[PDB]
């Protein structure tokens, strides 16, 4: 019967015990600006400062940065605490703080935000989350790998008994804006396209040129016009280019344009077209069971 | 300024180029389970977007909660 209790016992890895801080993951929907994001960080910041005065001893969030992808819809709050002696009581321990945090997150609208502790050796995952990649070997379309992917996120949602979050790090295919140029229009202008584009990414991606010295310090040079001048597609039409004659030329003299998708954060794993598939299991089920599950769903 | 005052000007937030070569905006349904409608989004105007197709004033368009919600989930309205 000793052997019975031996085999019936569940397992784990080395625990997330205390850190003194917790790592606060903040995710927004895509397309939203760093201004709206900044507003969100002010709100969450205001929550853990004002409504959590009693223990919170740090803040630091990064607007624009994500370790899960450096994009406009994410931010991180580094949130420390008091002394251990200054936080007695089980509610003054990090996990319950994160539980009340999750209740706040459920309360928080317009967001996908969660805080947590990292591993003590942070290079391992979430310690309940397997990392899972999935790569089309045949090159069958990243978008169709995304079809089969989020298809298998629906399938990954078909087993809530297995998992606790089937969530990816999917940075979505975006609305985005392709501008097409006619060369026979361009040769009708007789102007070098390379310098038109040099003008473009100079004014719409920004142009580095070279360096200089202040007080013995080599420094970069950047140039791109005003935000109000780099904001609209119609602002695109504002830009006039000298041609072989000397005439100032709108882009719209030769530029069509349209919209489409495209994800900013693409991924390739071992040099192979991949998408980040996180997952944590429901407590009481090993991740090898999740391997058997999703690998028998890798039949699909 | 300007021409005909009836002009469907929704801000940029619900504006989705969806799908490929296309552009829809998702409205809620009348029974709170949401209901996307493809619309001809015209030129962006200000912080907004001209639409010619279909929509009227008073149509229960959204802002915030579009990510926990897919078509088929009831919704309690907020502004």
């Amino acid at each position: 019967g000793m052997a019975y209790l031996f085999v019936r016992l569940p397992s784990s890895f080395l625990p997330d015990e205390d850190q003194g801080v917790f790592m606060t993951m903040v995710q927004l929907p895509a397309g939203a600006t760093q201004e709206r994001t900044q507003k969100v960080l002010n709100e969450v910041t205001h929550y853990y400062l004002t409504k959590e005065k009693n223990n919170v001893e740090s803040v630091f969030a990064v607007n624009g940065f994500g370790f899960a992808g450096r994009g406009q819809n994410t931010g991180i709050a580094f949130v420390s605490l008091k002394d251990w002696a200054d936080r007695p009581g089980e509610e003054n321990k990090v996990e319950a703080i994160t539980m009340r945090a999750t209740r706040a997150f459920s309360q928080i609208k317009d967001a996908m935000v969660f805080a947590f502790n990292l591993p003590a050796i942070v290079e391992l995952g979430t310690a309940t989350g397997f990392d899972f990649e999935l790569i089309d070997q045949a090159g069958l379309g990243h978008e169709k790998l995304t079809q089969a992917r989020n298809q298998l996120l629906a399938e990954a949602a078909k087993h809530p008994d297995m998992l606790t979050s089937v969530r990816p790090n999917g940075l979505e295919d975006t609305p985005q804006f392709k501008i097409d140029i006619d060369q026979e229009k361009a040769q009708a202008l007789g102007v070098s396209i390379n310098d038109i584009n040099t003008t473009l990414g100079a004014a719409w991606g920004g142009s580095y040129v070279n360096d200089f010295i202040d007080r013995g310090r080599v420094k970069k040079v950047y140039v791109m016009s005003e935000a109000k001048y780099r904001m609209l597609p119609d602002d695109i039409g504002d830009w006039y280019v000298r041609a072989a004659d000397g005439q100032m030329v709108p882009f719209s003299a030769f530029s069509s344009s349209r919209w489409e998708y495209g994800s900013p954060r693409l991924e390739r794993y071992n040099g192979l077209p991949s998408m980040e598939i996180l997952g944590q299991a429901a407590p009481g089920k090993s991740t090898g069971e999740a391997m058997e599950l999703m690998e028998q769903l890798a039949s699909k | 300024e300007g021409l005909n005052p009836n002009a469907i000007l929704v801000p940029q937030q619900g504006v989705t180029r969806t799908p490929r070569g296309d552009a829809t905006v998702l409205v809620v349904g009348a029974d709170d389970k949401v209901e996307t409608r493809p619309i001809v989004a015209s030129q962006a105007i200000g912080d907004k977007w001209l639409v010619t197709e279909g929509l009227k004033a008073g149509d229960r368009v959204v802002i915030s909660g579009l990510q926990k919600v897919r078509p088929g989930v009831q919704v309690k309205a907020q502004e």
Binding site: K109 | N6, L55, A57, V62, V69, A77, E79
Partner: peptide, 13 residues
């Protein structure tokens, strides 16, 4: 579940 739901009024141009 509640959602932020903002509704159309498009009177002038």
């Amino acid at each position: 579940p509640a959602v932020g739901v903002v509704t159309v009024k498009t009177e002038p141009l």
